[PDB]
Amino acid sequence: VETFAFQAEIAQLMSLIINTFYSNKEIFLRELISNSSDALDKIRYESLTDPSKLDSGKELHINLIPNKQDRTLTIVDTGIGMTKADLINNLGTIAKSGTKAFMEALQAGADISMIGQFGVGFYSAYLVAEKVTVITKHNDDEQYAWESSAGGSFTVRTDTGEPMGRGTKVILHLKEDQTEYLEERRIKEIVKKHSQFIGYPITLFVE
Ligand SMILES: Cc1nnc(Cl)c2ccccc12
Numbered sequence: 449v450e451t452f453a454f455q456a457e458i459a460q461l462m463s464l465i466i467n468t469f470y471s472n473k474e475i476f477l478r479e480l481i482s483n484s485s486d487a488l489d490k491i492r493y494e495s496l497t498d499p500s501k502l503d504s505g506k507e508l509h510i511n512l513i514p515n516k517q518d519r520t521l522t523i524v525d526t527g528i529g530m531t532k533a534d535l536i537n538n539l540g541t542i543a544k545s546g547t548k549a550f551m552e553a554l555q556a557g558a559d560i561s562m563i564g565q566f567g568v569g570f571y572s573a574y575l576v577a578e579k580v581t582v583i584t585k586h587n588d589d590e591q592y593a594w595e596s597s598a599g600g601s602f603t604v605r606t607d608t609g610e611p612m613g614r615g616t617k618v619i620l621h622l623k624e625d626q627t628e629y630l631e632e633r634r635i636k637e638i639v640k641k642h643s644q645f646i647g648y649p650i651t652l653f654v655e
Contacts, residue, residue: 487527
């Protein structure tokens, strides 16, 4: 298990997300689904020139999995996945410019729901989750588990668990007062409202 520090701007963005009073928390789901959709667009496009890129899985879909016992809501996709370099450096590096712009916009009237317009919507997961675990597998790399309870640090380890073939699972360990996002009717309401026109089948699992 390796422990890394988030870059200062990213740590600041996560603190803001965690500390700002903002009741419209549901937007986190639209943001994660949109991220899944972009990851699925990526593998689908690369597979046009290299069909073997789908040898790790032909299905392209998004599954939403609530688990009341564990208090988690998991967003699963069979998209392109993330390499170790993406997890420890590249994604955070790219999010720096969007972070600065977003934070500037916030001081100038914008609100949290616009986070996705700045390409840093993944961090909105912290509106609802006290901890986020990400299991991911990219064709060119091993399966990894990234995890963070914010606080300026995250971990990365090679994952020994059930192999996923290819894709990403975002496991949201929900805050005590955010369990409504485990309810079937609440999830459906949010997906219908914000994610109506996504081009991959989204399956809402039940318990
Ligand atoms: C920026 C970003 N987007 N999506 C996912 Cl699943 C991430 C996981 C770890 C770190 C950054 C992420």
